[PDB]
Ligand binder design. Structure first.
Ligand SMILES: C[C@H](CCC(=O)O)[C@H]1CC[C@H]2[C@@H]3CC[C@@H]4C[C@H](O)CC[C@]4(C)[C@H]3C[C@H](O)[C@]12C
Ligand SMILES: C[C@H](CCC(=O)O)[C@H]1CC[C@H]2[C@@H]3CC[C@@H]4C[C@H](O)CC[C@]4(C)[C@H]3C[C@H](O)[C@]12C
Lengths: 195, 195
């Protein structure tokens, strides 16, 4: 083709730098949103010790304060109902949301609707699973479980905690890799047209 | 400012592709070389299950084939004494091997001399630590260890295993990231050529 000027060359690069920055900011916001939710959830698990007391007359059953635990988990759900993983502002097409959902992890997000568009919500399945487990315990707002049943339910609570913690570390790793790839790509690209 | 032609822009991008390609070729041999080492060590790992057996008069202690394990580790160390991470063949400067040891991390390699020149050998210190820990167990071909002694020894053995495992994954992750830099640089070149 013809010639390209220095100004249009660097205008293309400045525009590409902005496009790369917006791409990396998607990972950064997804990490920050999921981190805040996991921190909120971890405070619920550490509060569990204060929501249980001796149950049977032998004293080796466990009385679970089910209404306290569900209220804490339900407030968790409502807090993040309108805090999507992507995008941080406004909405995108359903197809664009589906692509970013696969890019981040199918079990970490979930596509939902907003303002006539679509977003990638935080997948609340770990929270829904424990709200479901608590309702299957029955009871009068307070349930008395035998020791074997409490340890079984407690282990399921800790398994959901581990799933979310591993999801976060996976997302943190994807962000760190994307960061170093595109930080160095910009450094390479800037270095080689400057000289 | 000065105007550049499309062809000169292609050549600028192309020489960066060639620069990264030279970097990738050296980095790839270090990955395959260290992968082969850890794969051979995992062959020693799978044979360790058959080298421990009940050894107490009550069955409470652990009987370890310390000589078979020691000999297997020394053969692993001797197999890779002349197989360096860099260069793939011949030698290199002390300056050159020094900086390529820094680019590879410094933990996975060690600069050594080979007939006037220098190489970046595989750092076998995790294997040497295992050998001194085994030597500390004593015995004569086979040792009987109480449960406490076996668990302490196994924890140290596990830590050196995890050292090599983590060494490999950091190496693989950096190789993958540099490959993605290459791929995106190729996307840039392909786009500017078609434009
Ligand atoms: C995939 C993301 C966009 C993700 C999104 O939809 O928001 C885009 C945004 C910025 C994009 C890059 C912009 C610079 C480069 C432009 C080239 O012509 C093609 C490769 C590069 C390196 C792009 C690669 C990549 O296509 C990127 C990273
Ligand atoms: C820092 C990144 C790798 C990021 C990572 O995965 O850790 C590395 C990977 C490829 C590296 C380049 C390889 C080619 C060049 C080798 C030179 O001797 C030093 C500058 C160059 C241009 C390197 C620059 C940079 O050091 C790079 C981009």
């Amino acid at each position: 083709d013809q010639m390209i000027s220095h100004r249009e060359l660097w205008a293309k690069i400045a525009n590409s730098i902005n496009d790369i920055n917006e791409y990396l900011k998607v990972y950064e916001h997804a990490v920050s949103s999921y981190t805040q939710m996991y921190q909120d959830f971890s405070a619920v698990l550490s509060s569990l010790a204060g929501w249980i007391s001796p149950g049977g007359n032998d004293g080796n059953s466990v009385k679970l304060q089910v209404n306290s635990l569900k209220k804490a988990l339900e407030e968790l759900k409502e807090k993040y109902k309108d805090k999507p993983l992507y995008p941080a502002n406004n909405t995108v097409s359903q197809e664009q949301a589906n692509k970013w959902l696969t890019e981040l992890g199918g079990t970490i997000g979930k596509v939902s609707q907003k303002n006539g568009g679509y977003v990638v919500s935080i997948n609340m399945t770990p929270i829904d699973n424990m709200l479901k487990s608590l309702d299957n315990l029955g009871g009068n707002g307070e349930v008395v479980l035998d020791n074997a049943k409490y340890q079984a339910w407690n282990a399921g609570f800790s398994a959901e905690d581990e799933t979310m913690k591993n999801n976060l570390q996976t997302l943190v790793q994807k962000y760190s890799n994307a960061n170093s790839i595109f930080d160095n790509l910009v450094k390479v690209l800037s270095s080689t047209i400057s000289s």
